[PDB]
Write a structure and sequence with these properties.
Two copies of one chain form a homodimer. In chain A, 4% of the residues lie in helices and 44% in strands. By secondary structure, chain A is mainly beta. In chain A, strands 2, 7, 8, 11, 13, 14, 15 and 16 form an eight-stranded mixed β-sheet that branches. Chain A has a five-stranded mixed β-sheet with strand order 3-5-6-10-12, with no helix packed on it. Chain A has one helix and 16 strands. The first copy, chain A, has one domain: Viral Chemokine Inhibitor, Chain A. At the A-B interface, strand 4 and strand 12 of A face strand 4 and strand 11 of B. It is classed as cytokine. Keywords: beta sandwich, chemokine, cytokine. It forms a dimeric assembly.
């Protein structure tokens, strides 16, 4: 009635910090039809291998999400753990959400001090590289409801979180992304930050916005 | 008598800024013998492909230098251009030097304003990933002497230039690196910086040091 995975801590100055990433890709007109999402998820963290040693810098965890004619490569450094990855196809769009999971869902959701939270909020960086995919493999999904972070993508304090962003224009026409870092149990203002930008047919803009409906979460399907 | 590649400019507030990287890798005792350096050099810059677009961040140029039983992957972002890459094997050590080339050597050596220099010095970042290589192909070297940057690795103002540093301990025992950014025509103002560290059998140190002799540049062989 206490593990972080089963309950939000009552401990003062402790917060179950998490990250929540929303991705919306609008494919080019002549991109071949492919609505097979969640084809594969590959996770790799630097220094995990016995012989690999990260000497300088912090260990980055990479996620390669193949689906819907796209291969999305994410790179998270100094960010809360990702425990939920989902996708859904809609017309010529591929949508995805990668996030930490809030307490009470069988996923460890470590709680950290306010001090560490403030440091993490500034240090966490996410890179994204989206390339075309020709994968015709069937989807590999879970029927289980998508586990959430309990973090709303409403407008909050801005923070530069998104790092290197690269796309293959052969299949990526539009790219919209929203990233939130916050308290998964109860919004704590000083600890709520958000980044995001819009890329439309070549033009990128960074106007802050309410992204609570950037994508339709009710349609997300858990990738395995 | 006026192109940058042919002469240092006399234009005021103009500086032929360059970067100079020195690498010294001591391989592990039982690492299979391999003194074949300069096996291959591969350069790749983000956004150079007509379909690849860097939306956020600056374009990174990556160099993959295979030689001596090692594969050295470098990533330079916001740094002066690299126009000289060389190596030499000495016992269980593989030494390499990647750098810009000073004016008058047939290589473009652009001069920038002091303002731009001050920004580049803070922004330039180099990542390094040294892995094991089983490549046994013959060396592909150039005969001509190695073109230099005219930048001395003496102690100068420290700057955080070296970023992510990863090594494969199966082949990497020690790793010593020195990185200098400076005026290739005449050491200038607050335009000379240096980074560097020492990794010895697992222990890393960042103590400033005169690395003018970290490796013996007279032995460097130009890689093609």
């Amino acid at each position: 009635s206490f593990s972080s995975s089963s309950s939000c801590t009552e401990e003062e100055n402790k917060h179950h910090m998490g990250i929540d990433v929303i991705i919306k890709v609008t494919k080019q007109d002549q991109t071949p039809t492919n609505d097979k999402i969640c084809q594969s998820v590959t996770e790799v963290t630097e220094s995990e291998d016995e012989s690999e040693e990260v000497v300088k810098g912090d260990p980055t965890t990479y996620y390669t999400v193949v689906g819907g004619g796209l291969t999305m490569d994410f790179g998270f450094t100094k960010c809360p753990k990702i425990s939920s990855i989902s996708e859904y196809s809609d017309g010529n769009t591929v949508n995805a959400r990668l996030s930490s999971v809030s307490p009470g869902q069988g996923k460890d959701s470590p709680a950290i001090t306010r001090e560490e939270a403030l440091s993490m909020i500034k240090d966490c960086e996410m890179s994204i590289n989206i390339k075309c995919s020709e994968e015709e493999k069937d989807s590999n999904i879970k029927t289980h409801p998508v586990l959430g972070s309990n973090i709303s993508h409403k407008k909050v304090s801005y923070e530069d979180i998104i790092g290197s962003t690269i796309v293959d224009t052969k299949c990526v026409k539009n790219l919209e992304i929203s990233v939130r870092i916050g308290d998964m149990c109860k919004e704590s203002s000083e600890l709520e930050v958000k980044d995001g930008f819009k890329y439309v047919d070549g033009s990128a803009s960074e106007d802050a916005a309410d992204d609570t409906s950037l994508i339709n979460s009710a349609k997300l399907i858990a990738c395995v």
